[PDB]
Amino acid sequence: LEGKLGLLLGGLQRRHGDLTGRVGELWAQVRDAAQELVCFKALHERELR
Amino acid sequence: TSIPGLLSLFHDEWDANMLELHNTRTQLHQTRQELSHALYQHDAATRVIARLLKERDEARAALADMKQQY
Amino acid sequence: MFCSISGTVPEQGVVSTKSGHLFEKSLIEKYVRETGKCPVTGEPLSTEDLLPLKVNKTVKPRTAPATSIPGLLSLFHDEWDANMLELHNTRTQLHQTRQELSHALYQHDAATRVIARLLKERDEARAALAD
Amino acid sequence: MFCSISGTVPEQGVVSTKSGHLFEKSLIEKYVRETGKCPVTGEPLSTEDLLPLATSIPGLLSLFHDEWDANMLELHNTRTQLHQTRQELSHALYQHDAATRVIARL
Amino acid sequence: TAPATSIPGLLSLFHDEWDANMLELHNTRTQLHQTRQELSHALYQHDAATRVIARLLKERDE
Amino acid sequence: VRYRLEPPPQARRGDVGAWKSSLDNAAAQLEHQHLRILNQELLLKYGDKAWRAQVALDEAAVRGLEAQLAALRKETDGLNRERKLQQHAAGSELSKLERQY
Q: What is the DSSP string of C101-127?
A: HHHHHHHHHHHHHHHHHHHHHHHHHHH
* Mutation site, E30, E43, E53, E60, interface D, largest D CB count within 10 A: E53
Residue F21 contacts residue E23 (beta carbons within 8 Å): no
> How many Å apart are CA C47 and CA C52, to the nearest integer?
12
Q: What is the resolution of this structure in A?
A: 2.6
List the Cα angle B47/F72/B38 in 5-degree steps: 30
Which region, left, alpha or beta, applies to residue C73 given φ > 0 means left and ψ of -120 to 50 means alpha? alpha
Q: Which residues of A touch C64 (CB under 8 A)?
A: 2, 5-6, 9-10, 13
Residue C30 contacts residue D18 (beta carbons within 8 Å): no
Pick from F87, B51, A45: nearest CA to C115: B51
**CA C31: distance to chain centroid?**
14
CA distance D67 to chain F (A): 9
Sheet with D22-24, edge to edge strand ranges: D22-24, D13-16, D50-51
> How many Å apart are CA C21 and CA E8, to the nearest integer?
35
Q: Which residues contact D96 (CB under 8 A, 6 or more apart)?
A: E42, E45, E46, E49
Q: Which helix (H) or strand (E) holds D33?
A: helix D25-35
CA distance E53 to chain D (A): 6
Pick from D11, C109, A10: nearest CA to B45: C109
Count the Cβ atoms, other than its own, within 10 Å of residue E13.
15
CA distance B5 to chain C (A): 16
The burial of D1, by beta-carbon neighbours within 10 Å (0-12 exposed, 13-18 middle, 19 or more buried), is given as: buried
**Three-state DSSP class for residue C37:** strand
Q: Does residue F92 sit at the A interface (CB-CB below 8 Å)?
A: no
Q: Report CB contact under 8 Å: F60, D54.
A: no
**Three-state DSSP class for residue C50:** strand
The count of residues in chain E is 62
Going C66 to C68 to C74 to C77, the CA torsion angle's sign is positive
Query: E10 φ, ψ to 5°?
Result: -60, -40
> How many Å apart are CA C124 and CA B52, to the nearest integer?
12
Chains C and D touch (3+ CB pairs under 8 A): yes
First to last CA, chain F: 88
Q: Does residue F33 sit at the A interface (CB-CB below 8 Å)?
A: no
Going D83 to D85 to D86 to D91, the CA torsion angle's sign is positive
Q: Which residues contact C90 (CB under 8 A, 6 or more apart)?
A: B21, B24, B25, B28
Residue F87 contacts residue B47 (beta carbons within 8 Å): no
